[PDB]
Write a protein that binds this ligand. Structure first.
Ligand SMILES: Cc1ncc(C[n+]2csc(CCOP(=O)(O)OP(=O)(O)O)c2C)c(N)n1
Ligand SMILES: Cc1ncc(C[n+]2csc(CCOP(=O)(O)OP(=O)(O)O)c2C)c(N)n1
Ligand SMILES: [Mg+2]
Ligand SMILES: [Mg+2]
Lengths: 562, 544
């Protein structure tokens, strides 16, 4: 009938489909961590640092729904903040639990370790409040379970980080276990009825009038999961459907009505024209960041833009604050086919043609590779692309249906992906051990977070780690300073990283030509996720996707502008 | 004549003896970084991540006097914060410059990369203000030079981090070059004369009356440049002189009146007794109730505080007179140095107690000795240093992984000061994992530290306290000696030592003692092995 507060936390996490917990142990969280071992089906990742753990919790949340990272007071929590901030910016539900000193220790304002030496125990909490949806610092066992519940609810429903400070003295206190028999209620507060009705009615009327509507899926389509509603929207309507870089994967790219990746002026010409000639745009989850949009270059010819958002709706210039798109989309699906009844299906832009056959010795180039990559991918894959040439190139790759893309286009923290790949791999394993996790990471980016490969090995996770060796920071060389020393890096022996971190079941490969690329990626053995692999991909220093070359110039200009 | 604001920054850093700049590039700081190459004597480290860069800036400042790290808006600065916080906590003067979006980008609230997507360009600055002595976010070219000068002065004189945000557009605007011909004032303002004189008088009188006085040197002894003064204090008075763990290195341990390391109940029995039995204590730079506290920004004598009265100047003037006041003192015996290790067979497996005692044999004057949080930080308290040894042990903040970066920053600083100075790191296997990539940057710059890695298969210091077999205290086992070539080292040595004979043979070797190349030494130790001082506090945490 009773359970410790620490175990209560993990039982609640299990109820919200969290089975792996990220972070590192320290002075104020050890008794809490003990409780993981008491909950069947819960495991502790054992991360190699707190920043990487936060990146990993983000990757896990994207795939599983939410995540939890646990750190220790001061030294642990502050190391995580860049990971937390990226989860805030990108709308990823990560619960950050911090083990803190006992309530009396704080009251005595002792000169404890891991403090600023001034007796202020609130400072780190105050720092994190800036990048959290909400926070809690537990002080009272009587309200503790409700507060844990509140934090978990908020993390899941808002898909933003939440900070939960747990004093070490409270984790071993028993609370009634019966509390766990009432689930945390994840349902959304229903919309204002009148506002929602007006929104739905006017969208149906615009649909009835439109001769060339299009659907554009963006980040919040995925992050505030309306992927199922959006797929139904595409099917019931037959409208051409496009995706943004940040939303890529949110809609199935083998659907007959999929039209390609829209990136404003940086789109493939046919895609730009197909989208911008629309007489109605159904925009699901827009997040109009510089890199997502070719520096704010959208040029819709219609004023008829319907923006669906998690917390509001916009129709043309009219804003409907608080009207949540989930309920709007669900209700629209009931009548939308009828509204679309006039519609004569418009051709979608054709897929990029396959690469022409070339001699096997042809040196690898980016444009060739991103086009060729679609041959290797399979349904169910998680495909992760690091900020750098990889993030820009992957926009050119055609995904199989049911591909989960991760590209951190807004926050853009290089090194994120090594951690995200660990998190995505734990989550993928839990869902279906057949699902592959495929990473494209730059040589520069890998250096910032390389040690998290260690944690992949420790758990026998089997991602494909494609490392793009172009001898330094190519994306930056295109922005400014093509030969500047700050854009160069120490040259690593990438293929020795796995054995250096103690891998015992692995493969390494190197590819530098089109023949080598095709032979490796077509090999049946290589296509089974039987073990962790690293593939070093040798590419020219200044070679980059064409869209990045232009993006770089636009970005340099924006920064130098007086 | 005119110079860019960016080049102005690096000219000033040069003038205040900051010659290596840490951090990583990003679009918002690239134009700034170009300016490094325009200033002879300035270099860019090219760090492998920002947290490590901040750790390195901390090591550099400890040895050189102050440091500078440059990061990019949002993603870079937030990565650095645990480093910055440790520097705030331990009073290390690190200037954190962040390249931020242009003034026009901020005004128009452009939804740019590295923002939270909400148009708020103030948030990261506000976060850093919590762990900074002062901040500046530059908005006006006209007052930008004065603000840079203010930030640099404050970093050095307060020995705390300072945050300077530089919009990308402003770094390329021109300022009057003549400004550089007037130095930044980097000196402490003189003390209030009457207050300072009261303090000096009172101290002498307490000295005269004390039967069992001691000197105790703590963190701010070395950080605020009073090592020289303290040394003279020991000589003139001949009082027993002790250091704290954070102060270790700030008193030369070969002095006849040096009595050891005061670590409370974890001190050598004689040491604990000798300090705790004092009737007067001359406490230098702290970080019976008859205590004189010397601090960088104030003095305290028993219950009386003297705000603003700075120790640097009190100590100088005291020395002019101090000899007379202590002649009634009859030199009491200081605790004896720990006996050398007895001879044992060369095959004797290594244990920490033996190792920290033996380590003194290897160390030489001028060495920088860095010890990581974990068994290493406890063990080094047991090692006797040669004269002129600089210790780094982050006892207050205690962030594992700190030392890999600190070692990089210390090695750059030590190179600039004297190429013959060696940098010696003792880091645990666990801690190395958090910051391992910074070895890459050591190799890039041909730096030659000695990297001793304590392989005891996991987090021993935690295992001793809680969960001796808990999975969270275990780590993935790395091949440590492969790290150097994995990071592209060409000129290096690797060694493994598991016995006393192997330890002696290596560390006594003439070629090994020459800092001619980067070296890694993997030290094989038992899982539950630790120094006696840590075993003791394990029993204190026990006995419940
Ligand atoms: C944490 C962090 N620090 C710095 C940056 C700035 N930055 C953007 S791209 C980049 C280099 C990426 O290099 P690489 O991974 O080699 O990709 P490439 O373009 O060469 O494929 C850097 C340092 C960043 N985005 N995040
Ligand atoms: C950034 C950070 N995370 C976690 C901790 C908690 N912590 C203190 S000691 C320690 C273990 C250190 O292990 P190791 O470096 O192997 O030293 P050993 O005691 O084994 O010699 C940990 C995880 C910390 N102090 N700082
Ligand atoms: Mg690269
Ligand atoms: Mg260890």
């Amino acid at each position: 009938s009773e359970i410790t507060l620490g175990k209560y936390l993990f039982e609640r996490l299990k109820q919200v489909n969290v089975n792996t917990v990220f972070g590192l142990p320290g002075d104020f969280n050890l008794s809490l961590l003990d409780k993981i071992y008491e909950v069947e089906g819960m495991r502790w990742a054992g991360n190699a640092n707190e920043l990487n753990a936060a990146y990993a919790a983000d990757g896990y949340a994207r795939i599983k729904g939410m995540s939890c990272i646990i750190t220790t007071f001061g030294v642990g929590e502050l190391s995580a903040l860049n990971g937390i901030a990226g989860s805030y910016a990108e709308h990823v539900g990560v619960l950050h639990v911090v083990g803190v000193p006992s309530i009396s220790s704080q009251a005595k304002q002792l000169l404890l370790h891991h403090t600023l030496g001034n007796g202020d125990f609130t400072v780190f909490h105050r720092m994190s409040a800036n990048i959290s949806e909400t926070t809690a610092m537990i002080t009272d066992i009587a309200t503790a379970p409700a507060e844990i519940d509140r934090c978990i609810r908020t993390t899941y429903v808002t898909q933003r980080p939440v900070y939960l400070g747990l004093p070490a003295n409270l984790v071993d206190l028993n609370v009634p276990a019966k509390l766990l028999q009432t689930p945390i209620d994840m349902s959304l507060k229903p919309n204002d009825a009148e506002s929602e009705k007006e929104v739905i009615d006017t969208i149906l009327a615009l649909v009835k009038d439109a001769k060339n509507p299009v659907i554009l899926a963006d980040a919040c389509c995925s992050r505030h999961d309306v992927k199922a509603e959006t797929k139904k929207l595409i099917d019931l309507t037959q409208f051409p459907a496009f995706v943004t870089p940040m939303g890529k994967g949110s809609i199935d790219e083998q659907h007959p009505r999929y039209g390609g990746v829209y990136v404003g002026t940086l789109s493939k010409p046919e895609v730009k024209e197909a989208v911008e000639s629309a007489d109605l745009i159904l925009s699901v989850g827009a997040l109009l960041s510089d890199f997502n949009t070719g520096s704010f270059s959208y040029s819709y010819k219609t004023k008829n833009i319907v923006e669906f958002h998690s917390d509001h709706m916009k129709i043309r210039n009219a804003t409907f604050p608080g009207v949540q798109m989930k309920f709007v989309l669900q209700k629209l699906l009931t009548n939308i086919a009828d509204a679309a009844k006039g519609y004569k299906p418009v051709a979608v832009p054709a897929r990029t043609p396959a690469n022409a056959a070339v001699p096997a010795s042809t040196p690898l180039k980016q444009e060739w590779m991103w086009n060729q990559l679609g041959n290797f991918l399979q349904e169910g894959d998680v495909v992760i692309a690091e900020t750098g040439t990889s993030a820009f190139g992957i926009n050119q790759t055609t995904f199989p249906n049911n591909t989960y893309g991760i590209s951190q286009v807004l926050w853009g923290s290089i090194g994120f992906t090594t951690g995200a790949t660990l998190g995505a791999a734990f989550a993928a394993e839990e869902i279906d051990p057949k699902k592959r996790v495929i990473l494209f990471i730059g040589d520069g980016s890998l250096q910032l977070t390389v040690q998290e490969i260690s944690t992949m090995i420790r758990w026998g996770l089997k991602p494909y780690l494609f490392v793009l060796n172009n001898d330094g920071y190519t994306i930056q060389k295109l922005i400014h300073g093509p030969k500047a020393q700050y854009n160069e890096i120490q040259g690593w022996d990438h293929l020795s990283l796995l054995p250096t971190f103690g891998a015992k079941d692995y493969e390494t490969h190197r590819v530098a030509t089109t023949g080598e690329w095709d032979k490796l990626t077509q090999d049946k053995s290589f296509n089974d996720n039987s073990k962790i692999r690293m593939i070093e991909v040798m590419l020219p220093v200044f070679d980059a996707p064409q869209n990045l070359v232009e993006q770089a110039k636009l970005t340099a200009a924006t920064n130098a502008k007086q």
